Design a protein around this ligand. Sequence first.
Ligand SMILES: CC(=O)Nc1ncc(CN2CCCCC2)s1
Ligand SMILES: CC(=O)Nc1ncc(CN2CCCCC2)s1
Lengths: 461, 461
Amino acid sequence: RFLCGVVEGFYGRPWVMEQRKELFRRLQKWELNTYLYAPKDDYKHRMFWREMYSVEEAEQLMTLISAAREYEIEFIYAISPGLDITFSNPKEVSTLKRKLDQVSQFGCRSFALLFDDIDHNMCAADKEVFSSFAHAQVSITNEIYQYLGEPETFLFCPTEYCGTFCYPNVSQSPYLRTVGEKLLPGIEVLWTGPKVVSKEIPVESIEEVSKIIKRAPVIWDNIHANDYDQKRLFLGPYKGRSTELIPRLKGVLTNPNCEFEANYVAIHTLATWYKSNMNGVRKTDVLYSPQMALKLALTEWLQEFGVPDPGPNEKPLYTAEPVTLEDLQLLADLFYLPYEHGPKGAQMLREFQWLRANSSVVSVSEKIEEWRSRAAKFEEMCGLVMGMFTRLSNCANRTILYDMYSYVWDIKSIMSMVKSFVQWLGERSHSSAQFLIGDQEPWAFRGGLAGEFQRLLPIDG
Amino acid sequence: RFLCGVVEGFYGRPWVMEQRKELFRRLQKWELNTYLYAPKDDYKHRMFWREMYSVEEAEQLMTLISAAREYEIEFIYAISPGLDITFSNPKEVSTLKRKLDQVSQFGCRSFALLFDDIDHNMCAADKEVFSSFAHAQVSITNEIYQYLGEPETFLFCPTEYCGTFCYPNVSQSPYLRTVGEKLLPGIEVLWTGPKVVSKEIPVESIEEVSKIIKRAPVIWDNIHANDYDQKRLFLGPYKGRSTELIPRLKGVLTNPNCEFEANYVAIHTLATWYKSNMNGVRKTDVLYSPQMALKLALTEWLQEFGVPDPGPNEKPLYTAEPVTLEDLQLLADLFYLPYEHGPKGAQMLREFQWLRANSSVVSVSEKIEEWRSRAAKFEEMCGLVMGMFTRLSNCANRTILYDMYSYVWDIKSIMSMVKSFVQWLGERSHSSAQFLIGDQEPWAFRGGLAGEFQRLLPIDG
Ligand SMILES: CC(=O)Nc1ncc(CN2CCCCC2)s1
Ligand SMILES: CC(=O)Nc1ncc(CN2CCCCC2)s1
């Protein structure tokens, strides 16, 4: 059994019924199997873990759990008590049991305990009863695990849940030592790789962590997450993980973008990655191509954009220029991966800085010929980004469009300011006009009190 | 019978089941009665009005309609065919009937036809069969109205749906003349006032439009809408409409912010406005105070923010500094109304521009005393905005917080750049440091390709 699929475990707006049901559908049809319920901002999942779900809240989870059964997806309910739990207090342990009993009754059969993103410091009482932090955690986990009849799928998430989080390091951790020794063998351990958001999950570090936890980990992959508060979006393919990891892991769950529809690629490409070495035994990648996987994903995703007779003298059917595969390929390029822009977007950035760097060449002859030859192709590229923004804003699927609309609006806005600036640079040996940010539309014509103040900031001078 | 409540009729992400059910609950408990279903981006409502709803889409609308019945809210289903309908084609009229029949079968008993935001130009075929645009519309409306058994609640939305939209004007419109004459008397007419987003709906213009349409209109009020693409947010009270309008109107439906939870005030204050002259006969406001209505709203809304034993040596319960009424009063002030900032936010803006205007007074004696006395109180105000941002970002209710989080983040970001700038101005007669936008956090530490480009724009120089 290999757990593969999605963990809804980011900070931000939790997905709704409509979205989650749609996720289960897509997961089923791409042959994935797992959904881990972990919304950091489902108040009763973390913050107020003690509270029972209300009647309305209960009917919803039951429906949610039912749908997962209907689409053959295993629903794992996670709880995160580590913010304010007194481990040594028996009333606490009892409440944790009570909570997980409510969810069992809702129809859930697979559970997880999470101790991620909390501090190491125990309280006084706990420090008397427990040797270390790991000892407190493992004790309560094991107890819960056994109390629930030792379910087939039970997960544990460490506090030291990734390479950079282990004191003093991975292979010599007192915390991970305890976990790998004392935690019952029927329980899975979640791991994210070298870092929270791992650029690569090298096979070496998987063997390294495998040794100390004394089992194969389940990846909680944060490759596509965007909950870090400087809004980005990742539509690139699943990269950085060798298919050789598959036979060395108990599972891979991906914690994708907060915006739901922005996750087609992320989840699609993971399924392709998983299916490429589904059965393979234990032995850059010889089985999986991120470039070819992104293409397959975008090809199928395009079909999600499409539309669901009149006489020559009658009114023409509502229609607009269709979104093309090339449009999407450009979209993904511009909103690629956390550690890597796409080729064309990266190239546009180089070009813009070169043009601005060498703009003296046109201020007051062979460099002049190269500069213009480059500023031409740059404006021609800026034009394509606008082109595909417009086709995107016109498509039939409004749900997909509005999930990433603010991102698309931002880059569209910048490109035009950038295009104007290049034009204005290219015309200064025959123009006396001074460039100002306060002359544009996204800066000088911005709404709200926030904008009124922004215009008064020292822009240009 | 007075129709009062909400129209979901904006451009953007349509609300979901969870949100709409919550709306019905709140509407019921505030003694409102109506919900008009009009999402411009429900693809099968406008764009592809011909298409039947799918089985999945049907179960959802049935549930939605059922919930409205459960909370005693009248569900009105609207359709907008005016983008590509051939009025004269009998196959078209038949499809419009077929569509509205599906929805009737879902349990809906009240309907609306919308012809808002389309051009006046008919096609060739229609121009032969119909005298004018209004003639085409009224013909199809009347037909539908009668075919559905002349329902108790049927609405019509004009193309010339507001003052500024009538050629050549309101009282002398050929379009409105036809509508007021030919449109059956059992049908309501929607009106938004002098403009799309009316600052005021003067009693005079209501009598003016009443005469030509030959009936009392139902207001489709856009006071709180924010779908115009330069993101603002309106948490101010329902203002600009005299309670004298109530006995001169058949209804008021409000088309509020796209962000659902951002609409407590908007809908609350409307209920207060409506209840203040519920029964009153036909005779600045002597019955309703926007200031007192906003206070009542924020007072009750605060209760929506609240949280749903340990020994001295145990772990303290998770807690944080609570959101206060004064916090909300400040929040509403900063995100007030479309034509009006709140007092404190407006005052902060004046102060900032005065300080920047008179910053020479501290560049190289009595003005110096006034400037510092003012720059002090400004920084003290900037500090409060941060203060309440933080309390807000810490509250129990994550759904409310994340609905307006991007707005709150933007203003919070600007305030700090502004605070730094004032500080930097106040210290230049004893400092050699030059101010740069590219030194800050929201400009020089911004994520994504969009940011990389933004840093290369001519900021400061
Ligand atoms: C165990 C584990 O990985 N927990 C997580 N919670 C949320 C995540 C995504 N995001 C990454 C960037 C920083 C904020 C959080 S990762
Ligand atoms: C008849 C009527 O008012 N229709 C509407 N559709 C949407 C509305 C809100 N918003 C106002 C500002 C411009 C964009 C649209 S108003």
